[PDB]
């Protein structure tokens, strides 16, 4: 099998790669992390 614990750092880079929000419901917008819960912020696909 395989195991790894340093993955914690790696994922950071990925999330560090990306602020623009995207409408998912209508209206809720995902994204805007630095701007209302973890899933989303209280036409679909609009930026």
């Amino acid at each position: 099998t395989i195991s790894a614990a340093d993955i914690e750092g790696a994922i950071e880079d990925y999330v560090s790669s990306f602020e623009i929000g995207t409408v998912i419901d209508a209206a809720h917008v995902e994204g805007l992390p630095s701007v209302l819960d973890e899933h989303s912020v209280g036409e679909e696909g609009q930026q």
Partner: peptide
């Protein structure tokens, strides 16, 4: 940090700060 609050160790979920 705050989620809506998150602490290191329901599930500690008792933004980004």
């Amino acid at each position: 940090r705050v989620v809506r609050v998150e602490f290191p160790r329901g599930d500690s979920l008792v933004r980004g700060v």
